[PDB]
Design a binder for this molecule. Sequence first.
Ligand SMILES: Cc1cc2nc3c(=O)[nH]c(=O)nc-3n(C[C@H](O)[C@H](O)[C@H](O)COP(=O)(O)OP(=O)(O)OC[C@H]3O[C@@H](n4cnc5c(N)ncnc54)[C@H](O)[C@@H]3O)c2cc1C
Ligand SMILES: Cc1cc2nc3c(=O)[nH]c(=O)nc-3n(C[C@H](O)[C@H](O)[C@H](O)COP(=O)(O)OP(=O)(O)OC[C@H]3O[C@@H](n4cnc5c(N)ncnc54)[C@H](O)[C@@H]3O)c2cc1C
Lengths: 509, 509
Amino acid sequence: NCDIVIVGGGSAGSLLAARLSEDPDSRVLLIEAGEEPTDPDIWNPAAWPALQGRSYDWDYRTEAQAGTAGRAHHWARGRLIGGSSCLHAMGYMRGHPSDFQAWVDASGDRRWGWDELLPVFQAIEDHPLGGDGIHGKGGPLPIHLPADEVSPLARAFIEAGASLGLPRLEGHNSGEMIGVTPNSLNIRDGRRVTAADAWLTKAVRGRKNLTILTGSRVRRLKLEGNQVRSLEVVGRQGSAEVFADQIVLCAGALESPALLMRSGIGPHDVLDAAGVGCLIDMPDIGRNLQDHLLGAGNLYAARKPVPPSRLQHSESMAYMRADSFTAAGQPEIVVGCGVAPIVSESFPAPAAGSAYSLLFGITHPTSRGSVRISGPELGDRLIIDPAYLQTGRDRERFRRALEASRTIGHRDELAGWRERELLPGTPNSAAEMDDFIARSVITHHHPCGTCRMGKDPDAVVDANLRLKALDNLFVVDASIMPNLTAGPIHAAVLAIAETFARQYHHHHH
Amino acid sequence: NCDIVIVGGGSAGSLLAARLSEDPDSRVLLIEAGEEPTDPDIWNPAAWPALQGRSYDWDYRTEAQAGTAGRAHHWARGRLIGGSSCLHAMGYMRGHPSDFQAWVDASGDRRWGWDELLPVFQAIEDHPLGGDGIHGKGGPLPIHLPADEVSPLARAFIEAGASLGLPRLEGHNSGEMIGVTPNSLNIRDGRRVTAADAWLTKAVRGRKNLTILTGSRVRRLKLEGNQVRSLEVVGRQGSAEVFADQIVLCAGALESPALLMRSGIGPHDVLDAAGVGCLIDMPDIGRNLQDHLLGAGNLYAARKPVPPSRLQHSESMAYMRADSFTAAGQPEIVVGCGVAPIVSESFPAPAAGSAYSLLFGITHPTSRGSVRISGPELGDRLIIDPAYLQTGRDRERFRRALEASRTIGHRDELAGWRERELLPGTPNSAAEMDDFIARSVITHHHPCGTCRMGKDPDAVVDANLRLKALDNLFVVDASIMPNLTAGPIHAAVLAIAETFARQYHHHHH
Ligand SMILES: Cc1cc2nc3c(=O)[nH]c(=O)nc-3n(C[C@H](O)[C@H](O)[C@H](O)COP(=O)(O)OP(=O)(O)OC[C@H]3O[C@@H](n4cnc5c(N)ncnc54)[C@H](O)[C@@H]3O)c2cc1C
Ligand SMILES: Cc1cc2nc3c(=O)[nH]c(=O)nc-3n(C[C@H](O)[C@H](O)[C@H](O)COP(=O)(O)OP(=O)(O)OC[C@H]3O[C@@H](n4cnc5c(N)ncnc54)[C@H](O)[C@@H]3O)c2cc1C
C-alpha cells in the first residue's frame, strides 16, 4: 500500500511528491487531473497571457460581482503537471514579514513566522544573493534578478518611483518589500522554470517509490471512522479506488474545498443544496476566499512604440504605503508597470505598441468571499463569489492606489514615454473614481484561504495542516492561507508545502 | 547632429532606417549609393534574371577559381534603394534551427538561437499561417505560399520528391526544412515586394527625423580615439563630411569590409598592399567569405513546351540529407526545380521552352574565401576569392547532390515532362563527376560572413554586432553571419537587422 497519496500535482503537489519520496521507505502516489505538458509556448515567458483559455486551463467564471459594476470574472487555473505554475507570470515574491505575523496570530504557531520561514524559503531558493543569510543558495527553484533585460519603460517607471522617495531594492525578498525594483522571476537561461521543472526532475521521476498518475481526477474521499480510507479516482476510461494511509490535498484554492464538499465534508446546508450527504459539518470549508485585484488600468498613450518586452510583460511592482511614498513598513497598495496596454473588458483595447498600463491594487483586501459546489459531480460548476470590493476599506484603499498610480504616471521621469493619460481621465468625485475602479479591476490570480488554517474550533485545518475532524488528512496548498501575502503568493504556497514536507519527515514511520 | 547614420539602404539598411526612426527622439540618416528605383521591370517577378547586368547592378568579377575549372564568376549586387532585394529571386527561407545553433556557439549568445529568433521572424512576417505560434502575422514583409500558380513542371517535381520519401511541407519556415514544397515568396497581389517597399513606406519616408540620401557613396570612416567621428561621403558633384554619434554599417557582404579597409581598419598587410595606412589591424576583416553554389545544371530535354512560368522561375527547392530521402534533420544538400533551362556559361543554351534544369547544391559549404580592397579608391576593384569547392567535403557533398538530382530527375512522376537527360549524361567516375560539377556551378548569390560575429578575440564584431575595436560602430548585414543558413539568406539578414533594431531601442538615450 502507498503510504501517502498527494492530490493535485501543481505547485505544492510537485514540491511534495519530490520531497516526500526522498524517504525511500515511504511510497508516494501523486494524482494529477491534467496531462503531462506538451505545449511549447508555456516555456516562453512572454506567451503567458496567451495560454489561458486553452486546453490545460480550468477557466472558472465567478458570480456577477456587485462591487465590480456587476461584472463576472474569469479565473484561470492550470490543469497539467505543474498546475498554476505552468500558466503563471513567474514573479517571485515571498511576501512581507508582517503578512506572516498574522499567520502566527491565526495559527498560534511560530513556525509560520518570518524567522522560522527564513530557512524554509532558503531551502527552496537558488538565488544570486545566496550567502546573504537571507536569500537561499543552491535550492531547486532558480530566482533571477533581471538587470540588462529590464525594458526601458520599466526603468523609467522605477526612476519615477525612486524620485518620489521609494527606496531601490534588489528584488522584494529581503524582508523589505516597499520600494522600487524589477520583479524577481523564476527563470533560468532565458527559459521559465515551473515547480514541476524544479522538483519533478528526471531523477526524481525515476524513483521506484514514486508513482505519478496523470489525467486522473479525485472525485471523493471515502471515510471510515476518523480516517480517510480510500480515494475514488476518475480516469479517462473508468473510475477506481486507491487506498492510502495518509492523504495530502494539493488541489488548490478552488478544487481542494470542492473535493472536501463532494466527499460529504463541508457546510451541511451547502451540501444539502448540492445534493450531497453531509458526513462532517464544517462551516468554514469554502469560506474566507481571498484574491488580489489589479485595476486594468491607468492607461497611457505612448510617445513612441512600446516593445513586446524581453521578459514577462509585468516587469516591476512597486509596493508602498497608501499615504506616502517615503513611509516604510508592510505594503498597503501596489502599482505595477505593464509593458502591455492591459485593460479590462470594460475598455476597448488600444493598438499594440501604442500604449502602456500602470496596474494598481491593494495588497491586503478585507473583503471575504466563498466557493461552493453546485452538485456532487466533477463537471458541476463551482459557485465562486470572491466578494470583490465589498468593504469600505477595500474601496477606499483602492482610491489611494489609483491616486498613487496617476502620481507615478505623470512624473517627468516618464515624460519620454508618456504621450498622455487615456484612462481614467480625471474623475471629479469619489463616486466617479469608484465607478472607474469597479469597471477596471481584474483578478491578480491569487485565490486562497478557502480551507483556512487556524487555532479556533471552526478553522478547517490546525497549525499542522491537518483537517481538524480527521486523523490522516492534510491540506497543503493556497487554500490554507489565513490571509493573502502583500504580493503574488507562489512563494508562500511553496513555503507551505516545504514546511509540511519537513514536518512529515520529522514525525512518522 | 544625427544620432545614427546607416550606411547602405539595402535589405538590412531599409529595415533599420524604418525601425530606428520609430523613436521620434532619434535623428536617423540613411546613406545609399544607388538611386531611387525607376525601372518598372524589377517589380515584375519573372524578369529577375533580366535586370542584373544593368545600371543598378554592381557586377563584381571573382578571381579565377581553381575549384571550378579555373572559371571566374560574376557576382551581381543591387545599387539602388532596396539593395539586393530589388534584384532577388524573392524566395523566403528562414533557415534551419541548427543553422542558428552554430551562431549561438560562435557568438556565445542565445539571442541568435531559433527560439529567440522566432518572435523576431514573427515581427517581420505577414504570413497566411500567422496565428501558428510559428509564422508571423501582420508584419511588414508579406510571405506568399503559392498553390494554384505553381507550374505543372514544379508540381511533377514535388511529386517526384514526395514519392522518394520527402515529406510535404507548407513552405520551408516551420522549423522543418527538409522536404518538398513550393518556395514561399515575398509577393503581394501578384507584384514582388522589396525590403524598401515593405519598410520604407510613404509614411516612413515622411518622418521628420529620417533623412534619406541617395546617389551617395561612403568612402571612409574618420576615427577619433575609440570612436568613429565622421563619414566622408562622395556624391555626384563632390564630397562632404557627415557627423554622427552612432554608425551602423549595412553595405553588404562585399562593401562593408571594403569600407572598413578603406578606413584603415583591416589586415595590416592587405592595407599596405592596397596603399592604405593601417589604423586598426583586424586580421579577420574580409575573411571567412561564404556563398552557396548551384550546379547549372542537371539539364533535361522536355517532351513538351516548358512555359516561362507564372512565378519566379525557380519555384521549388527540395532540401534534404545527402544519403537518404527519408532522413530528417538539418539539410546537407538541395535540388531545385528550374522552369528555365539554366546552364552555366560552360554549356550552350538550349532553345527556350525546349528544356528544364534541376539545380543542385550543398547547403553548408566548409570552403572559406576572402575579399580585399586593391586600393584606397571607390572604383578600385575588390579582389574576391570565394574559394569555391576547395575542401574535399564540399566536393564530395556536391557529388551526392548531383546524384540526388539525377535520381529525382528520372522518376516516373516526371516522365510526362522528361524527354531525356542532356547533362551531365553519365560520368563513369568521381573525377568526371567532379569535372562536370566544376564546369557547371554558379553562385546562388548569398555572399556573407566577411565581418564575422564571434566571441573570440579576433572576431570582427561581438554578439551585439559592435566592431570590437571601436565604441560607436556596428555592422548589421550579411557580412556578420558566422555561417550560411541552409538556403537563401534574406530572411536571416532581415532577422539580423531586426534584432539589432530591438537591441538599439532597448539601450540608449
Ligand atoms: C495566470 C496566473 C498567473 C500567476 N502568476 C503568478 C506569479 O506571477 N507569481 C506568483 O507568485 N503566483 C502567481 N500565480 C499564482 C500561483 O500560480 C498559484 O497561487 C500557485 O500555483 C498555487 O499552487 P497550488 O498548489 O495551491 O494550486 P495549483 O498550482 O493550481 O495546483 C493544483 C493542481 O491540482 C490539480 N487538481 C485539481 N483538482 C484535482 C482533482 N480533483 N484531482 C486531481 N488533481 C486535481 C490541478 O490540475 C492542478 O495541477 C498565478 C496564477 C495564475 C492563474
Ligand atoms: C540576384 C540575386 C538574387 C537573390 N535572391 C535571393 C532570394 O531569392 N532569397 C533570399 O533569401 N536571398 C536572395 N538574395 C540575397 C539577398 O538579396 C541578400 O543576401 C540580401 O539582400 C543582403 O542584404 P544586405 O543588407 O546585407 O546587403 P544589400 O541588400 O546588398 O544592401 C547593401 C546596400 O548598400 C549600398 N552600399 C554599398 N556600399 C555603399 C557605400 N560605400 N556607401 C553607401 N551605400 C553603399 C548598396 O548600394 C546596397 O543598397 C539574392 C541576391 C542576388 C544578388
